[PDB]
Design a protein around this ligand. Structure first.
Ligand SMILES: COC1CC2(C1)CN(c1cc(Cl)c(C(=O)N3COc4c(cccc4-c4cc(N5[C@@H]6CC[C@H]5COC6)c(C(=O)O)cc4F)C3)c(Cl)c1)C2
Length: 285
């Protein structure tokens, strides 16, 4: 059995919540809080351990971008600090290849990173890899066919519909087919050999649209839109289905959790988070 973990987020200030949802019975476990509250972080899992990467602590006493990497063990209910990244990265994207964590883009104040770095849990060390062709904050990250994809975001001037791919053996990036829609702060994941980009902001409107990248045809196709338009949503895959958690729609910090079934091409509202929040990091283990 596996759970959907949600770490951090934002509602009035950055949050430290760590909760786990069980899609089988609809329950939520309240787990050990993060040591530092963070929103705009990303989550990932390597060897059954959950990692909270980057983000920012927006508090009444100040706003600080995070270069932190923290590791949570579900067996011990404890968070442990790991080696920090070279730079703080708020609104970061993360992907895992062969048990190695890639921290992609994100911001540190007014700096919009195009830099990318890779963490080895086996050595507790980070190292920079080739930088992206585009600076991207609010970027979605997908791992497919041992390639790392960086989708959408904001380059410091424009919100982006562009996407690019990293080749680990060659240590290089190339631009791929751009999405139909500009999406900054979308939820990006991989399901059944396809990349999905759900929601996000196009520069004018919060989106409920969802599009899917097919590798063989190099095309983005729209699938069923979500019930609730949202940006800065958590996203993950559990048992062949996509789950989107929270986010912000221009008026509300959503507690909605929707689930996409690819066989029927339908979204259904399956539960609510214990409190409405945006900018969470999510992972399954
Ligand atoms: C009472 O007024 C207050 C309430 C207020 C203003 C504090 N409000 C807040 C405060 C916060 Cl700390 C957040 C939040 O969770 N963040 C900050 O943005 C992001 C987070 C994570 C991923 C992407 C974005 C992002 C979010 C963006 N924004 C888009 C889509 C969401 C966000 C705002 O709407 C436009 C953009 C962008 O502008 O392109 C780029 C991104 F990387 C984390 C949100 Cl979502 C709203 C909203």
């Amino acid at each position: 059995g596996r759970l959907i973990y949600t770490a951090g987020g934002y509602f009035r200030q950055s949050l430290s919540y760590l909760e786990a949802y069980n899609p089988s019975d609809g329950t939520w476990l309240r787990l050990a809080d993060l040591q530092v509250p963070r929103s705009g972080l990303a989550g990932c899992v390597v060897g059954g351990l959950l990692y909270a990467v980057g983000g920012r602590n927006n508090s009444p006493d100040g706003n600080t971008d995070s270069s932190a990497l923290d590791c949570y063990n579900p067996m011990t209910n404890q968070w442990s600090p790991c080696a920090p990244m070279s730079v703080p990265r708020n609104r970061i994207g993360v992907g895992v290849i062969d048990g190695h964590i890639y921290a992609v883009g994100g911001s540190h104040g007014c700096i919009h990173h195009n830099s990318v770095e890779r963490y080895e849990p086996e050595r507790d060390e980070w190292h920079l890899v080739a930088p992206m062709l585009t600076r991207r904050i609010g970027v979605g990250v997908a791992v497919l066919n041992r390639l790392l994809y960086a989708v959408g975001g904001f380059d410091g001037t424009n919100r982006l519909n562009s996407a690019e791919c990293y080749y680990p053996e060659r240590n290089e990036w190339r631009m791929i087919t751009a999405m139909n829609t500009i999406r900054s702060g979308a939820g990006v994941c991989v399901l059944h050999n396809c990349i999905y980009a759900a929601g996000g902001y196009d520069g004018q409107d919060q989106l409920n649209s969802v599009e899917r990248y097919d590798v063989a045809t190099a095309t983005w196709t729209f699938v069923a839109p979500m019930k609730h338009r949202r940006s800065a949503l958590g996203i993950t895959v559990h048992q062949g289905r996509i789950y989107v958690l929270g986010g912000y729609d221009g008026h509300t910090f959503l507690d909605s959790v929707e689930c996409y079934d690819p066989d029927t091409d339908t979204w259904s509202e399956v539960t609510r988070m214990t409190s409405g929040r945006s900018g969470v990091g999510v992972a399954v283990t």
